Design a protein around this ligand. Structure first.
Ligand SMILES: CCCCCC/C=C\CCCCCCCCCC(=O)O
Ligand SMILES: CCCCCCCO[C@@H]1O[C@H](CO)[C@@H](O)[C@H](O)[C@H]1O
Ligand SMILES: CCCCCCCO[C@@H]1O[C@H](CO)[C@@H](O)[C@H](O)[C@H]1O
Ligand SMILES: [Ca+2]
Length: 261
């Protein structure tokens, strides 16, 4: 359980460029990091696109452009999560179609959980910590686009109050992905068995890492339930956009995820 935990933690370190530790020293102005360029209005968003942060489909409008940048980040994160998941021997022994089912229904729960690592009450890191976008700027955009990020901030700040670290997060994200009750899963008993091992490891770890945090394990099982519901709401928002924002482009991978939800 301890060697198991360490292995998943190494896979997490190996596969995610931004960790919470890195994100926190950037956000607190630690000596070994260059400060991010702050995106707080339309002119700074435009400067960031010119080269101060970033070196997409045809430009439509400000709100849509921000949406396109949201898609770039989540699709890149899906890439990192796939590699992370593959780095767990038990995951890679599953038939490839089961691996796809798990990632399809698990990646957004994992994304919204990890998002908390790069967030404070004022905004979020973007572009590998090279930028900071303000929560206020995001709320200012047109209706469907402002409404989709705000609930993630809301979840994140309460989640952040639990004070997890990267070693905790490794096990938590592994438990999210390796979930046996996903629709269309083929070998349910094997996946459920892998997941309980991960969960046991997580409880074993939290006892050592957070000794005075009695109730932390059941608190986290509830966050998994909350994430499932936050993704259900997000998929409905995404379907509305597809239906009503017909000039707005959506990445083919994302179309494949939200199909059937
Ligand atoms: C300049 C704008 C930078 C982008 C800010 C958002 C970046 C990361 C947050 C990821 C969650 C955003 C929620 C919207 C996700 C829509 C795409 C998807 O569903 O995959
Ligand atoms: C390891 C070899 C892979 C064999 C491929 C078997 C194809 O199964 C397909 O897997 C998909 C989930 O991933 C589902 O969306 C489809 O409904 C299902 O038909
Ligand atoms: C690595 C990216 C994670 C994969 C997420 C996308 C999963 O899409 C699914 O892929 C299957 C083909 O394999 C299709 O049968 C399903 O219709 C489709 O919904
Ligand atoms: Ca389970």
């Amino acid at each position: 359980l301890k060697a198991f935990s360490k292995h998943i933690y190494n896979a997490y370190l190996k596969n995610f460029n931004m960790t919470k530790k890195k994100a926190r020293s950037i956000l607190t102005g630690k000596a070994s990091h260059t400060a991010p360029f702050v995106i707080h209005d339309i002119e700074t968003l435009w400067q960031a696109e010119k080269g101060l942060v970033w070196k997409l489909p045809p430009y439509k409008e400000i709100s849509v452009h921000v949406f396109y940048r949201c898609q770039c980040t989540t699709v890149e994160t899906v890439r990192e999560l796939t590699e992370f998941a593959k780095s767990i021997p038990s995951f890679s022994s599953l038939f490839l179609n089961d691996q796809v089912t798990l990632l399809k229904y698990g990646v957004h729960e994992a994304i919204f959980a990890m998002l908390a690592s790069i967030v404070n009450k004022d905004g979020l890191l973007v572009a590998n910590g090279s930028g900071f976008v303000t929560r206020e700027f995001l709320r200012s955009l047109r209706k469907p686009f402002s409404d989709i990020i705000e609930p993630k901030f809301e979840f994140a700040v309460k989640f952040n109050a639990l004070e997890l670290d990267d070693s905790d997060l490794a096990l938590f994200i592994a438990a999210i992905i390796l979930c046996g009750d996903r629709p269309g899963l083929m070998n349910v008993p094997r996946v459920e068995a892998i997941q309980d091992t991960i969960l046991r490891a997580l409880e074993f770890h939290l006892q050592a890492n957070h000794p005075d945090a009695q109730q932390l394990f059941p608190k986290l099982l509830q966050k998994m339930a909350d994430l499932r519901q936050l993704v259900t709401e997000h998929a409905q928002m995404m379907q509305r956009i597809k239906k009503t924002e017909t000039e707005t482009s959506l990445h083919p991978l994302l179309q494949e995820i939200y199909k059937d939800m």
